[PDB]
Homo-oligomer: A and B are copies of this chain.
């Protein structure tokens, strides 16, 4: 019951590793340091009537 992911590696020049979960609890697992997504659309641009960035956005 193993699962294979990719190792973090350099760019411009896909090596795999293995992981097996041994314990019965979800707090026992290793930390998930491979989630790189983001969404800064709720902190920047937190407005109504979404602006255009080419118009003056007033008058």
Contact = CB atoms under 8 A, between A and B. Distances in A.
> For this complex, into which size category does the number of interface residues on chain A fall?
20 to 34
Given A1-B2, A2-B1, A8 B20 contact: no
Interface of A: 1-2, 4, 7-10, 15-18, 20-26, 29, 33-34
Main secondary structure of the interface of A (DSSP, over half): loop
CB-CB nearest 5 A-B residue pairs: A1-B4, A1-B18, A9-B26, A17-B21, A7-B26
**Which of A18, A20, A26 has the most chain B CB atoms inside 10 A of its CB?**
A26
Nearest to A34: B24
Contact of A8 (B1, B26, B33, B34): B26
